[PDB]
From a paper:
Since DPP8 and DPP9 share a very similar substrate binding mechanisms *in vitro*, and since DPP9 crystals are notorious for being less well ordered, we also tested for a possible interaction between DPP8 and BRCA2. Similarly, in DPP8 all 3 copies of the asymmetric unit exhibit clearly interpretable electron density for the di-peptide. The well-ordered R-segment, a hallmark of ligand binding, was well defined and ordered and supports full occupation of the active sites. There was no trace of electron density for the rest of the peptide ([Fig fig2] and [Table tbl1]). (B) Shown is the N-terminal di-peptide of BRCA2 bound to both DPP9 and to DPP8. Omit map (Fo-Fc; 3σ) of a BRCA2 peptide soaked in DPP8 crystals (C222_1_) and in DPP9 crystals (P12_1_1). The R-Segment and SUBA are highlighted in orange and blue, respectively. For simplification, shown here is a monomer of DPP8.
Dipeptidyl peptidase 9 **(**DPP9) is a serine protease cleaving N-terminal dipeptides preferentially post-proline with (patho)physiological roles in the immune system and cancer. On the molecular level, proteases of the DPPIV family are serine aminopeptidases that remove dipeptides from the N-terminus of substrates having a Pro or an Ala residue in the second position (NH_2_-XaaPro/Ala). DPP8 and DPP9 are the only known intracellular members of this family, both localize to the cytosol, the nucleus and associate with the plasma membrane. Here we identify an association of human DPP9 with the tumour suppressor BRCA2, a key player in repair of DNA double-strand breaks that promotes the formation of RAD51 filaments.
Residue numbers in the entry:
A (entry chain A), B (entry chain B): 48 to 72, 78 to 105, 109 to 138, 148 to 897
């Protein structure tokens, strides 16, 4: 063969090319179905959703009772409405929200009350309650406040839509939107105090639980209100209280660089103490008229450590829908033992200073009342937290039924219907001892598996189940038809068997089912077609309600249609020497000259909880992998072992071994291609990735000087001893029980292994990164300098983990092309060597 | 004219080249003469001095009463002795100490008591006092303490050498070194309280005073002790007391990168508040036994803003020889108004909590007693502070004679013998008003200029004046013979005639004159010969005491001989279009070729207070400029207008106009060289400097995008609003009244002016730099990314403003050479364009 050299564009010509290709180019979400219940009118439902017009607001569309099955009905988007703090900027990093405006909302089917934060303000309108359905945009009603700082995480009370709660300065507040009454429920954080002195918070999820467990709230309204004798009621808020006094303090640069100051930050470094956590409960007494009689604040009868021995993370929490028990999913620190636990409000006593008054209240509580561990699972690998957990109405007082999902039985996540016996505990507090390990555990009456197979149910990033308690069905999202396509399925939970698919093959679907289970919405795409949102109607043959079929109904969002100037990559697979099928994407270069070999650029992530290779449209996010092909680079992407959507066995492959397996799969796939395509120049191969991808880019250059000419590492994790507990320990365990794994997985501990030629290493970092701190890069550079190695370095001083400012994104793309051109593809590059 | 191209060495090759040449390659200082008074012994004096054996410690040599004039005598060095915290590490950055061991020392003439810090320890020995002279090394006596943290800045009481003082946690302590008694004199700083809430100090110079006024001390012993009736005595200490509570707080990265924390410290940013400062005095009453009886603390009778209207910085301070008055040099904030001031101890009243006893104490002090301004000068350029100031024993008790130095009168710094009348002031505290700005001023009886001419007396960086009161002479260093050589001069202060030069021309000398004025020591070098140190004997014909002659006496340190593998540069000069002569240094590329033109690297500083071109040995400091010449680069260095040693008009050139002029001079001299020598390729010129030098490198690349191919900016000031008060306001003035100056002199405010070609800009910065904070670089990167301009960046995370870690230095030289080779010198560099 004969080497292809990429054209040598100037920095200003490359800026032009990139700007011209970009000169062209968020879909609906948070859907809600509301019945009109109007016989005379032509509309059966009204659907509300968030979407970009620009800013992000509530829209609505009208679901008609029938359709012209000749034509395609495209629903019109009626606008519903007529319109950053260091708390807003940090939360919108933890959720990975790129949008601006309304991020989420809250609704009360009874009242028709919408409640939503929008900038610094909290608003509320009504629609679809007794007050009817607007035919034009509504003007929102601002909630009044005496509070001086931004109100975070507003929630409607499900039992009373006059009452909302919110967090201000790390304490829970309630406000009545009709009576204008306002009230602070917790006095845990002085806002005037400094960081080190206070370090306490109520109703807020701590950093680790937003970053690594995607849980953002830490208080939960009780769904039912209890009546006082004189025609009032009691409302309940369960909340987690946090004390981060032992948690290590990090400083990270304040975005306003002019100040030259840093922001204090609680970061549980791997090995260090996580925050101290316990449950609490506010009892709020309301009189008949809707004003606050009194607010009792209640603590657990015994300490948290005693009742929930071994629990470190409060992964999830809420209420049974009866309002009877507060439930919670709890992990041990190793993230190998998960427990579902019911907690009676009778476990909470009022907080008292008097030692003799508490011992009085303690005596009042009976020994029968005790935490109930309705479920427990263990794994030699790790427990992946998900959002799937459905509690049924209680038939007998002494059983609870529920659906949960687990990778622990099969090696693959499946739904399971479980009945638990609510036995009274062996243990009595009377004895005055610390309860045994299995003293609170409930017997398992039945454990019916609703699904099974060499495929998994999805329960993260908004994937979930939807139970039809009438037809005794459960809709879920799965990889049953393929690992590269997510599809909607339905199945009986009473007598499970056949698993009916509802989405059409050849597309990967993100799905949302009406609360009435008579409609669903699919956001679907494939490698060649950009995302469409469509609305399908569910009906059953009248001989068997257990059986469900779909009928396309109306389009909510039409695709722009196979984008021109974009050549999609072709998916491939190959059998590993490890006995797994690995999948990849190949961007062949545009205008393929026969008799020529091209420089190959391997883009990588390779970390857990992620899959790059699937049948989705990569034209939006990975448009620049296409642009590289248009300049005459081969671009390769390989989902190596540890990637998600392949079962726990596949994922657990790098437990304790991070950075020691992923590249051997990247190279195995990179060679399977070279053997099959003589147009791949293995002498000019570069690797680029961000975050975990940037990590492996550096491992690629240490482990394999031979294969990879240049590594471009963005926000790389150079030192696992610095990452947080929630993530690092899930995969690497405590650094005492993996001395060697932490050493071999930390690229900064191994700077001598880097090349002694320049123009091979390029390091990129967000200067204000609060997730992968900039000290990963600053400490690797320190050891490269000692080892007399050379590096190239671009800092993005306004950026954090993600790149938000576009000027930054443009510079990153411009530099990356120029760098690959100057140090890989072009003629001048081969001369430099 | 054929282009020469430098041999493209690899990164590993270039590292070897440097390590090989680096494989090849401190003189004595702090000299002090003690007379032996041995009429029968062969030795007249014994000199004590600090030098490197290895550690830096005290040595002595013997001065012969007589010498064989036929031969040279080389004095053998006898060792006198028998063998970092955060605040000791910052002091060494402010002083710019590289050496380890003993930095300075004290000596009580009467007792023979030495006193010196060495690491954490404080030690004393005796030699040359009543107790005679050691023939063998003495053992250092540790001053014991109860003080937890390290002790900074020890000083011997001259009025009793049993007592010493020192600073501990920003308070003044005294310790008797025979009774081991240890007393704390000030209670202004809580070591355990956080620095944000404390920010008060006593006896310490604040940051700007150490950085910009090279004053490293804030307390002063009274040099005589008043006697008591019982037979004890009163010792006194004058001390500056600062409050940094209103001074902006900055965060620099902690050097322990593992912690990912930042150290808070107080930085007076241009235009913000300098610390509130005042004078105080500690009266220590000691008994006849030597035990402390009592300690009264005393404040000024009126606030510092009243007694010293206008004074922003206390520049220097101390006591007159009898200790009748304490004196102080005082600047206004614009540093255009120097005042000298006498403050009687009688101005200080005991500090009393009672509001009514303090009133009885105020009236007790006479209204006659008042601050005495004995000298005031003003300039529309600015005041350069200096260590020259001499007060004569008082003859008339209403007059005071002294010697000061000033550029204000003639435009060059010259000595002046001044008598001032101490007329009791008109202002009275009884009247109870504030004084007019002229009320403490003093009539000026005479003012005889001792020197004059277009050349300056030197009074910075250890240059000072020795004063023979017996013969009424004053020895001083000056630029009279040339700007490129410093020389030792002597002249009468009674009948100031002509100026006898004592040093030999053809060399540049730093000098040090026996307190007896019968000897002097010169450390001297020239462009070709490394620094020597010789001892000369002063002699006068018995007919005329003014006539002064020298005679070589002994070698203290022999030259290392002319170094091989080092060609020196040749000094040049050129008439500027501005009218001034400018000097330069040319390193011709070793092994010149006929007809061939070579790549050129201009090393630059160009800031004030510094001259790079002079007749001193550059073989140590600028060794690598010659290493650049040995590879093929022409190397050029020019002292543009602003640089020191050429008078106040030459310096004042860039008042308010920093950045706007300097490069015109650098390019003028570059073109002068290009006309006379045709080997200077002007199509291949790089510029490189550190700090101000890196600043001008960035200005050269904006302003002259045509003359300069690459710029390599080290630790460069990019935003004058960020730099400190005492420096920026001295030249650029307050920012709100020179708004255009600050804009035009700030490269980051002009990022659009930078090239759009890559491989032309290199930013180098110490990550922990606390002087030119790394925000200068990060904010400039901020604006360069916005503007879409390319840059190369290198960080040194171990280093602050200097480069101390040897591995950081090796990597800097190696990158600097490779970047020059790959982007300026070689043929591949010509292909890149």
């Amino acid at each position: 063969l004969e080497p292809f050299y990429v054209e040598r564009y100037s920095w200003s010509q490359l800026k032009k090319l990139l700007a011209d290709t970009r000169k062209y180019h968020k879909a609906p979400h948070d859907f809600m179905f509301v019945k009109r219940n109007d016989p005379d009118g032509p509309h059966s439902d009204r659907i509300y959703y968030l979407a970009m017009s620009r800013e992000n607001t509530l829209f609505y569309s009208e679901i008609p009772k029938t359709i012209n099955r000749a034509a395609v009905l495209m629903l019109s988007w009626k606008p519903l409405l007529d319109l950053y703090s260091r708390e807003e900027e940090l939360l919108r990093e933890r959720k990975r929200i790129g949008t601006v405006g309304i991020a989420s909302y809250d609704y009360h089917q009874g009242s028709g009350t919408f409640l939503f934060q929008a900038g610094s303000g909290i608003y509320h309108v009504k629609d679809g309650g007794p007050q009817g359905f607007t035919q034009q945009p509504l003007r929102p009603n601002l909630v009044e406040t005496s509070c001086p700082n931004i109100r975070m995480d507003p929630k409607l009370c499900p039992a009373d839509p006059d009452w909302i709660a919110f967090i201000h300065s790390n304490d829970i507040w309630i406000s009545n939107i009709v009576t204008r009454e306002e009230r602070r429920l917790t006095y845990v954080h002085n806002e005037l105090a400094n960081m080190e002195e206070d370090a306490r918070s109520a109703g807020v999820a701590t950093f680790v639980l937003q970053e690594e467990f995607d849980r953002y709230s830490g208080y939960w309204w009780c769904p039912k209100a209890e009546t006082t004798p004189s025609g009032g009621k009691i409302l309940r808020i369960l909340y987690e209280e946090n004390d981060e006094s032992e948690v290590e303090i990090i400083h990270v640069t304040s975005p306003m660089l002019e100040t030259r100051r840093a922001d204090s930050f609680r970061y549980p470094k791997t090995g260090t103490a996580n925050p101290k956590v316990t449950f609490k409960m506010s009892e709020i007494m309301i009189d008949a008229e809707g004003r606050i009689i009194d607010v009792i604040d209640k603590e657990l009868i015994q300490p948290f450590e005693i009742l929930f021995e071994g629990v470190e993370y409060i992964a999830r929490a809420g209420w049974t829908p009866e309002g009877k028990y507060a439930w919670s999913i709890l992990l041990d620190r190793s993230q190998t033992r998960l427990q579902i636990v019911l907690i009676s409000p009778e476990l909470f006593i009022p907080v008292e200073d008097d030692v003799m008054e508490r011992q009085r209240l303690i005596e009042s509580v009976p020994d029968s009342v005790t935490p109930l561990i309705i479920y427990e699972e263990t794994t030699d690998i790790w427990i992946n937290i998900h959002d799937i957990f459905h509690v049924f109405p209680q038939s007998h007082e002494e059983e609870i039924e529920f659906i949960f999902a687990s990778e622990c039985k099969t090696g693959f996540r499946h739904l399971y219907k479980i009945t638990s016996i609510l036995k009274e505990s062996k243990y009595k507090r009377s004895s005055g001892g610390l309860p045994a390990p299995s003293d609170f555990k409930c017997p398992i009456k039945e454990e019916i598996a609703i699904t099974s197979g060499e495929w998994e149910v999805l329960g993260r990033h908004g994937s979930n189940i939807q139970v039809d308690e009438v037809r005794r069905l459960v809709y879920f999202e799965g990889t049953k038809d393929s690992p590269l396509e997510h599809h909607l399925y339905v199945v009986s939970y009473v007598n499970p068997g056949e698993v009916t698919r509802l989405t059409d093959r050849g597309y990967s679907h993100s799905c949302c089912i009406s609360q009435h289970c008579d409609f669903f919405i699919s956001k679907y795409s494939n490698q060649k077609n950009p995302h469409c949102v469509s609305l399908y109607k569910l009906s059953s043959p009248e001989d068997d309600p257990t059986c469900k079929t779909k009928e396309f109904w109306a389009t909510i969002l039409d695709s722009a249609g196979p984008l021109p100037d974009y050549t999609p990559p072709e998916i491939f697979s190959f059998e590993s020497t490890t006995g797994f099928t690995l999948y990849g994407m190949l961007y062949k270069p545009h205008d393929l000259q026969p008799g020529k070999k091209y420089p190959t650029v391997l883009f990588i992530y390779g970390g857990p909880q992620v899959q790059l290779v699937n049948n989705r449209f990569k034209g939006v996010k990975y448009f620049r992998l296409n642009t590289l092909a248009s300049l005459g680079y081969v671009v390769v992407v390989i989902d190596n072992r540890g990637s998600c959507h392949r079962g726990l066995k596949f994922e657990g492959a790098f437990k304790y071994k991070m950075g020691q397996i992923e590249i051997d799969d990247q190279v195995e796939g990179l060679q399977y291609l070279a053997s099959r395509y003589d147009f791949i120049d293995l002498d000019r191969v570069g690797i680029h990735g961000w975050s975990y991808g940037g990590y492996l880019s550096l491992m690629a250059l240490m482990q394999r000087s031979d294969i990879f000419r240049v590594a471009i590492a963005g926000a790389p994790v150079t030192l696992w001893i610095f990452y947080d507990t929630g993530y690092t320990e899930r995969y690497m365990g405590h650094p005492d029980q993996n001395e060697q794994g932490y050493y071999l997985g930390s690229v900064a501990m191994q700077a001598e292994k880097f090349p002694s030629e320049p123009n091979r290493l390029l390091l990129l970092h967000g200067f204000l990164d609060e997730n992968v701190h900039f000290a990963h890069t600053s400490i690797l550079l320190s050891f490269l300098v000692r080892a007399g190695k050379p590096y190239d370095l671009q800092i993005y001083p306004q950026e954090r983990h993600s790149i938000r400012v576009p000027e930054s994104g443009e510079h990153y793309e411009l530099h990356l092309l120029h760098y690959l051109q100057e140090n890989l593809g072009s003629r001048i590059a081969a001369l430099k060597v």
